Short mmCIF file of C-alpha atoms and ligand atoms in Angstrom, two decimals:
data_model
loop_
_atom_site.label_atom_id
_atom_site.label_comp_id
_atom_site.label_asym_id
_atom_site.label_seq_id
_atom_site.Cartn_x
_atom_site.Cartn_y
_atom_site.Cartn_z
CA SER H 1 116.27 106.10 100.46
CA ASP H 2 116.15 103.36 103.10
CA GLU H 3 119.18 101.08 102.66
CA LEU H 4 118.15 98.90 105.60
CA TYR H 5 114.72 98.28 104.10
CA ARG H 6 116.33 97.65 100.69
CA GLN H 7 118.81 95.04 101.86
CA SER H 8 116.23 93.48 104.16
CA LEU H 9 113.70 93.14 101.34
CA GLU H 10 116.43 91.77 99.10
CA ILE H 11 117.57 89.04 101.48
CA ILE H 12 114.03 88.20 102.61
CA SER H 13 112.42 88.09 99.15
CA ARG H 14 115.35 86.07 97.82
CA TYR H 15 115.08 83.56 100.68
CA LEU H 16 111.28 83.25 100.51
CA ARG H 17 111.25 82.77 96.73
CA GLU H 18 114.24 80.40 96.81
CA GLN H 19 112.62 78.29 99.54
CA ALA H 20 109.56 77.89 97.31
CA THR H 21 110.91 77.57 93.76
CA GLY H 22 113.85 75.49 94.95
CA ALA H 23 116.08 77.55 92.68
CA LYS H 24 118.66 80.22 93.50
CA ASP H 25 118.11 83.72 92.17
CA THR H 26 121.60 84.10 90.69
CA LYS H 27 120.80 87.72 89.77
CA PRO H 28 123.44 90.22 91.00
CA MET H 29 123.11 91.53 94.57
CA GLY H 30 122.83 95.25 95.25
CA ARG H 31 124.92 97.27 97.70
CA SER H 32 126.78 95.33 100.42
CA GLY H 33 126.21 92.23 98.29
CA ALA H 34 128.72 90.30 100.38
CA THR H 35 126.73 90.94 103.56
CA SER H 36 123.50 90.11 101.73
CA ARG H 37 124.96 86.85 100.40
CA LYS H 38 126.35 85.74 103.77
CA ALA H 39 123.01 86.67 105.33
CA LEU H 40 121.26 84.51 102.75
CA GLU H 41 123.50 81.55 103.61
CA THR H 42 122.92 82.04 107.34
CA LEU H 43 119.18 82.23 106.69
CA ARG H 44 119.42 79.07 104.60
CA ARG H 45 121.04 76.98 107.33
CA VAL H 46 119.51 78.47 110.48
CA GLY H 47 116.16 79.13 108.80
CA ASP H 48 115.70 75.61 107.45
CA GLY H 49 116.72 74.36 110.88
CA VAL H 50 113.99 76.46 112.50
CA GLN H 51 111.43 75.28 109.97
CA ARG H 52 112.36 71.71 110.90
CA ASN H 53 112.29 72.33 114.66
CA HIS H 54 108.88 74.04 114.63
CA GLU H 55 106.94 72.19 111.94
CA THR H 56 103.81 71.72 114.07
CA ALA H 57 103.67 75.35 115.21
CA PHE H 58 104.12 76.74 111.70
CA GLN H 59 101.51 74.30 110.35
CA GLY H 60 98.96 75.25 113.00
CA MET H 61 99.63 78.96 112.59
CA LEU H 62 99.23 78.65 108.82
CA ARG H 63 96.00 76.75 109.35
CA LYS H 64 94.75 79.49 111.68
CA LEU H 65 95.68 82.43 109.44
CA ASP H 66 93.73 80.94 106.53
CA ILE H 67 95.69 82.58 103.71
CA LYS H 68 93.91 81.85 100.45
CA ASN H 69 94.40 85.05 98.48
CA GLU H 70 96.27 88.34 98.20
CA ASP H 71 93.80 90.23 100.40
CA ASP H 72 94.60 87.79 103.21
CA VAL H 73 98.32 88.37 102.64
CA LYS H 74 97.49 92.05 103.04
CA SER H 75 95.45 91.51 106.19
CA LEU H 76 98.00 89.35 108.03
CA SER H 77 99.99 92.52 108.74
CA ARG H 78 98.15 93.26 111.99
CA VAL H 79 98.39 89.76 113.49
CA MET H 80 102.02 89.50 112.36
CA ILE H 81 102.75 92.80 114.11
CA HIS H 82 100.99 91.61 117.28
CA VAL H 83 102.68 88.21 117.57
CA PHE H 84 106.14 89.44 116.53
CA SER H 85 106.29 92.56 118.70
CA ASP H 86 106.45 90.51 121.91
CA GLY H 87 108.84 93.16 123.20
CA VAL H 88 111.57 90.54 123.30
CA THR H 89 113.86 91.43 120.41
CA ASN H 90 116.38 88.70 119.63
CA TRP H 91 117.83 87.41 116.36
CA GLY H 92 116.01 84.12 116.95
CA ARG H 93 112.74 86.05 116.72
CA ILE H 94 113.75 87.54 113.37
CA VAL H 95 114.91 84.18 112.00
CA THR H 96 111.64 82.64 113.19
CA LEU H 97 109.71 85.39 111.38
CA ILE H 98 111.55 84.91 108.08
CA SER H 99 111.41 81.12 108.38
CA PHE H 100 107.66 81.11 108.86
CA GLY H 101 107.67 83.55 105.96
CA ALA H 102 109.38 80.85 103.92
CA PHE H 103 106.95 78.19 105.13
CA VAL H 104 104.01 80.39 104.14
CA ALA H 105 105.67 81.03 100.78
CA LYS H 106 106.01 77.28 100.21
CA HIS H 107 102.31 76.85 100.92
CA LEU H 108 101.54 79.82 98.65
CA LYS H 109 103.38 77.97 95.90
CA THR H 110 101.55 74.73 96.69
CA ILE H 111 98.26 76.53 96.20
CA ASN H 112 98.39 78.34 92.86
CA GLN H 113 99.49 81.67 94.31
CA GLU H 114 103.15 82.52 93.66
CA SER H 115 101.79 85.98 92.88
CA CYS H 116 101.50 86.54 96.64
CA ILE H 117 105.05 85.50 97.58
CA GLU H 118 106.52 88.93 96.76
CA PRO H 119 104.03 91.18 98.60
CA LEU H 120 104.20 88.92 101.67
CA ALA H 121 107.96 89.46 101.87
CA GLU H 122 107.42 93.22 101.76
CA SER H 123 104.95 92.98 104.65
CA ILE H 124 107.49 90.96 106.61
CA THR H 125 110.19 93.50 105.79
CA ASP H 126 107.80 96.35 106.49
CA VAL H 127 107.29 94.94 109.97
CA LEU H 128 110.90 94.12 110.79
CA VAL H 129 112.15 97.50 109.62
CA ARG H 130 109.40 99.46 111.40
CA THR H 131 108.97 97.64 114.71
CA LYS H 132 112.62 96.85 115.42
CA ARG H 133 114.49 99.57 113.52
CA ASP H 134 116.64 101.25 116.17
CA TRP H 135 117.44 97.82 117.58
CA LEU H 136 118.65 96.60 114.17
CA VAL H 137 120.73 99.77 113.84
CA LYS H 138 122.33 99.14 117.24
CA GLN H 139 123.20 95.53 116.38
CA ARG H 140 125.17 96.64 113.30
CA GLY H 141 122.35 95.27 111.14
CA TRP H 142 122.84 92.17 109.00
CA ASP H 143 126.58 92.36 109.63
CA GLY H 144 125.70 91.54 113.23
CA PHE H 145 123.14 88.96 112.11
CA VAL H 146 125.78 86.93 110.27
CA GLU H 147 128.33 87.54 113.05
CA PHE H 148 125.72 86.30 115.51
CA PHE H 149 125.18 82.92 113.86
CA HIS H 150 128.84 82.20 113.15
CA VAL H 151 129.83 78.72 114.31
CA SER L 1 111.38 101.11 117.59
CA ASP L 2 111.70 104.18 115.36
CA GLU L 3 112.57 107.36 117.23
CA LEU L 4 112.90 109.31 113.98
CA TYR L 5 109.34 108.40 113.00
CA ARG L 6 108.11 109.20 116.53
CA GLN L 7 109.71 112.64 116.82
CA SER L 8 108.81 113.54 113.23
CA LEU L 9 105.22 112.48 113.80
CA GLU L 10 105.05 114.49 117.01
CA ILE L 11 106.41 117.66 115.42
CA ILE L 12 104.34 117.36 112.24
CA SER L 13 101.09 116.44 114.00
CA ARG L 14 101.54 119.25 116.52
CA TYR L 15 102.25 121.83 113.82
CA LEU L 16 99.26 120.74 111.75
CA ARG L 17 97.20 120.76 114.96
CA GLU L 18 98.26 124.17 116.29
CA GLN L 19 97.76 125.63 112.81
CA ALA L 20 94.34 124.03 112.32
CA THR L 21 92.93 124.91 115.75
CA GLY L 22 94.92 127.89 117.01
CA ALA L 23 95.48 126.21 120.36
CA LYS L 24 98.61 124.45 121.57
CA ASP L 25 99.18 121.01 123.07
CA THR L 26 100.69 122.12 126.39
CA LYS L 27 101.48 118.47 127.15
CA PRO L 28 105.30 118.10 127.25
CA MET L 29 107.23 116.53 124.37
CA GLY L 30 108.79 113.07 124.42
CA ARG L 31 112.49 112.21 124.29
CA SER L 32 114.85 114.89 122.94
CA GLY L 33 111.98 117.33 123.45
CA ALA L 34 114.41 120.24 123.63
CA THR L 35 115.05 119.76 119.91
CA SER L 36 111.41 119.05 119.06
CA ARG L 37 110.19 122.30 120.61
CA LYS L 38 112.71 124.37 118.66
CA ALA L 39 111.74 122.38 115.58
CA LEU L 40 108.13 123.41 116.18
CA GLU L 41 109.06 127.09 116.64
CA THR L 42 111.24 127.09 113.53
CA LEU L 43 108.41 125.34 111.69
CA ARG L 44 106.03 128.06 112.86
CA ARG L 45 108.29 130.78 111.45
CA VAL L 46 109.49 129.46 108.09
CA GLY L 47 106.36 127.34 107.61
CA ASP L 48 103.87 130.16 108.02
CA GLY L 49 106.13 132.14 105.72
CA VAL L 50 106.06 129.39 103.09
CA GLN L 51 102.27 129.07 103.26
CA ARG L 52 101.85 132.84 103.12
CA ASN L 53 103.95 132.79 99.95
CA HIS L 54 102.58 129.68 98.19
CA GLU L 55 98.86 130.06 98.96
CA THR L 56 97.90 129.91 95.26
CA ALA L 57 99.79 126.74 94.29
CA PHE L 58 98.59 125.17 97.53
CA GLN L 59 95.03 126.10 96.57
CA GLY L 60 95.60 124.43 93.21
CA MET L 61 96.99 121.18 94.59
CA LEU L 62 94.00 120.44 96.85
CA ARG L 63 91.61 120.52 93.90
CA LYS L 64 92.66 117.02 92.86
CA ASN L 65 86.16 113.30 102.50
CA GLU L 66 87.74 110.89 104.99
CA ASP L 67 87.98 108.25 102.26
CA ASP L 68 90.58 110.17 100.26
CA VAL L 69 92.96 111.10 103.09
CA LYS L 70 94.62 107.70 102.65
CA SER L 71 94.78 108.38 98.91
CA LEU L 72 96.84 111.59 98.91
CA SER L 73 99.81 109.33 99.71
CA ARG L 74 100.65 108.51 96.09
CA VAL L 75 100.51 112.01 94.64
CA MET L 76 102.38 113.32 97.69
CA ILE L 77 105.14 110.76 97.17
CA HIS L 78 105.37 111.62 93.47
CA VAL L 79 105.43 115.40 93.96
CA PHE L 80 107.83 115.10 96.91
CA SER L 81 110.30 112.98 94.91
CA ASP L 82 110.17 115.78 92.33
CA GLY L 83 112.85 118.42 92.89
CA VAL L 84 116.05 118.26 94.93
CA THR L 85 116.20 116.74 98.41
CA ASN L 86 116.59 119.85 100.56
CA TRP L 87 115.13 120.98 103.88
CA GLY L 88 112.97 123.56 102.12
CA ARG L 89 111.00 120.84 100.33
CA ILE L 90 110.36 119.11 103.65
CA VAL L 91 109.16 122.41 105.07
CA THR L 92 107.00 122.67 101.94
CA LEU L 93 105.47 119.25 102.59
CA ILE L 94 104.72 120.10 106.21
CA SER L 95 103.32 123.57 105.42
CA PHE L 96 101.07 122.33 102.65
CA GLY L 97 100.00 119.43 104.87
CA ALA L 98 99.12 122.07 107.46
CA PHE L 99 96.92 123.94 104.98
CA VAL L 100 95.23 120.69 103.93
CA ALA L 101 94.73 120.11 107.64
CA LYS L 102 93.06 123.52 107.91
CA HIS L 103 90.66 122.48 105.16
CA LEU L 104 89.69 119.48 107.30
CA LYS L 105 89.42 121.69 110.39
CA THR L 106 86.77 123.61 108.49
CA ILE L 107 84.88 120.88 106.60
CA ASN L 108 85.38 118.17 109.25
CA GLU L 109 89.31 117.45 112.66
CA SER L 110 88.86 113.70 112.26
CA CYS L 111 91.27 113.32 109.35
CA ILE L 112 94.18 115.45 110.54
CA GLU L 113 96.11 112.76 112.43
CA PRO L 114 96.07 110.10 109.70
CA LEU L 115 97.25 112.84 107.33
CA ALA L 116 100.12 113.62 109.70
CA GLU L 117 100.94 109.92 109.80
CA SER L 118 100.96 109.81 105.99
CA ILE L 119 103.24 112.85 105.75
CA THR L 120 105.61 111.37 108.32
CA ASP L 121 105.54 107.99 106.58
CA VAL L 122 106.45 109.42 103.16
CA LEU L 123 109.12 111.67 104.64
CA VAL L 124 110.88 109.15 106.89
CA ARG L 125 110.68 106.40 104.24
CA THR L 126 111.73 108.25 101.07
CA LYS L 127 114.36 110.42 102.74
CA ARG L 128 115.41 108.06 105.54
CA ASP L 129 119.20 108.09 105.14
CA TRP L 130 119.27 111.81 104.37
CA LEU L 131 117.38 112.36 107.63
CA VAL L 132 119.62 110.10 109.72
CA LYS L 133 122.30 112.25 108.18
CA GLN L 134 122.11 115.98 109.02
CA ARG L 135 121.49 114.79 112.61
CA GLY L 136 117.76 114.96 111.87
CA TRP L 137 115.68 117.69 113.49
CA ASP L 138 118.84 118.97 115.15
CA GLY L 139 120.13 119.84 111.70
CA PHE L 140 116.66 121.05 110.78
CA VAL L 141 116.94 123.70 113.49
CA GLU L 142 120.60 124.33 112.63
CA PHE L 143 119.56 125.10 109.05
CA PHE L 144 117.24 127.97 110.00
CA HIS L 145 119.27 129.39 112.88
CA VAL L 146 118.37 132.99 113.79
C1 YO0 F 201 107.90 78.81 117.23
C2 YO0 F 201 106.42 78.70 117.64
C3 YO0 F 201 105.29 79.42 117.06
C4 YO0 F 201 105.35 80.45 115.91
C5 YO0 F 201 104.80 80.17 114.67
C6 YO0 F 201 104.87 81.15 113.62
C7 YO0 F 201 105.49 82.39 113.85
C8 YO0 F 201 106.06 82.67 115.13
C9 YO0 F 201 106.77 83.81 115.71
C10 YO0 F 201 107.07 85.12 114.93
C11 YO0 F 201 105.95 86.17 115.15
C12 YO0 F 201 105.25 86.71 113.86
O1 YO0 F 201 105.35 85.72 112.76
C13 YO0 F 201 104.20 85.79 111.85
C14 YO0 F 201 102.90 85.88 112.38
C15 YO0 F 201 101.79 85.95 111.52
C16 YO0 F 201 101.97 85.92 110.15
C17 YO0 F 201 103.29 85.83 109.60
C18 YO0 F 201 103.47 85.80 108.20
C19 YO0 F 201 104.78 85.71 107.65
C20 YO0 F 201 105.89 85.65 108.50
C21 YO0 F 201 105.71 85.67 109.88
C22 YO0 F 201 104.39 85.77 110.44
C23 YO0 F 201 107.07 83.44 117.05
C24 YO0 F 201 107.74 84.13 118.13
C25 YO0 F 201 108.46 85.44 117.82
O2 YO0 F 201 107.84 86.61 117.77
N1 YO0 F 201 106.59 82.20 117.25
C26 YO0 F 201 105.99 81.71 116.14
C27 YO0 F 201 104.12 78.97 117.80
C28 YO0 F 201 102.67 79.41 117.59
O3 YO0 F 201 102.00 78.32 117.05
C29 YO0 F 201 100.59 78.50 116.91
C30 YO0 F 201 99.81 77.47 116.33
C31 YO0 F 201 98.42 77.63 116.18
C32 YO0 F 201 97.81 78.81 116.61
C33 YO0 F 201 98.59 79.84 117.19
C34 YO0 F 201 99.98 79.68 117.34
N2 YO0 F 201 104.56 78.08 118.71
N3 YO0 F 201 105.90 77.92 118.61
C35 YO0 F 201 106.68 77.03 119.45
#
C-alpha cells in the first residue's frame, strides 16, 4: 500500500508510453485522478520542452548507456541512481528524469522493444520514490508539482 | 530520503544481529533513537515470545546458500500479504527473519544484512501507508506498552 508509488508509476508510465506510441491512454485514472491528469498535462508541456532544450545531452547519454535489451533496462538502475541523486532535489531534476525516461522510451520503440517501456518506468518510479521520498512528501507531492509549474 | 526505511532497517537488522550473535551493537542509534531503542526492547520481549511459541511452523517454513537469500522475497511477500494487517504479523515477520538469521549464523553471518534489507523492503513497501499511519515505531511501542 504505497499511494505515492502508485500515482507516480501511473503518471510516469502513462507519459512514457504516450510519448512513444503518440496516443493517449484514455483508460480511467485511479485515486486522485484529477491530480494525476493535471500532472500528466504539466509533464506533457514542461517535459517536451525539456526534451527539446537538452536534445544533445539526452542523445549522448542514450548513446553511452547502450540500452539494447531488457537486461540493460534492469542494469541502468545503478547509474540512474548515481546521476539523479546529486543531492540537489528540485522539481526540474524530476522533470528531467521523466523526460529522459520518455526519450529513452521513444528510442525503445524505435528499436523493436516496446516490451521494455513498462519496466523502465517502474525503475524510474522506484528511484524517485526511494531516493527522494520524504522530500516529495514535504512538497505536498504531485499537488505541489502541478502547483509549481503553474504559469 | 526515506527515514521510515532507515529506522526500520536499523531496528530489524539490529534485532536479527543481536539474536544471531548474542552481542549488542553498542553504537548509538540514528535519528529518533529514543523510539528505536524501545522498539528493539519491545521486539526482544514479544519477538522472543513469538519465536518460542512458533518454533515448529518456523522450522517448517525454512525447508523450502547465499544465492537464495534474494529469493525468499517472493514467498515472504505472499505469506505476509496473507492474513490481516496487524502489528503481530509484522512482529511475526521480524521474529521469523531472526530465526532464519540464526540459521545463517550457524551455517554461514554473510547473508544476515541482505535478509534484513529484504524484510524491511517488503514491510515498508507493502504496508507503507499503514506504517506512516500509527505513527510508525512510536505506535509499535505504544501497542505493546507494559
Ligand atoms: C540535462 C543534461 C544531461 C542529462 C541527461 C540525461 C539525464 C539527466 C539527469 C537526470 C539524472 C538521472 O537520469 C537518468 C540517468 C540514467 C538513466 C536514466 C534512464 C531513464 C530516466 C532517467 C535516467 C540530469 C540531472 C539531474 O539529476 N541531467 C541529465 C547531461 C548529461 O549528458 C551526458 C552525455 C553523454 C555522457 C554523459 C552525460 N547534460 N545536460 C545538460
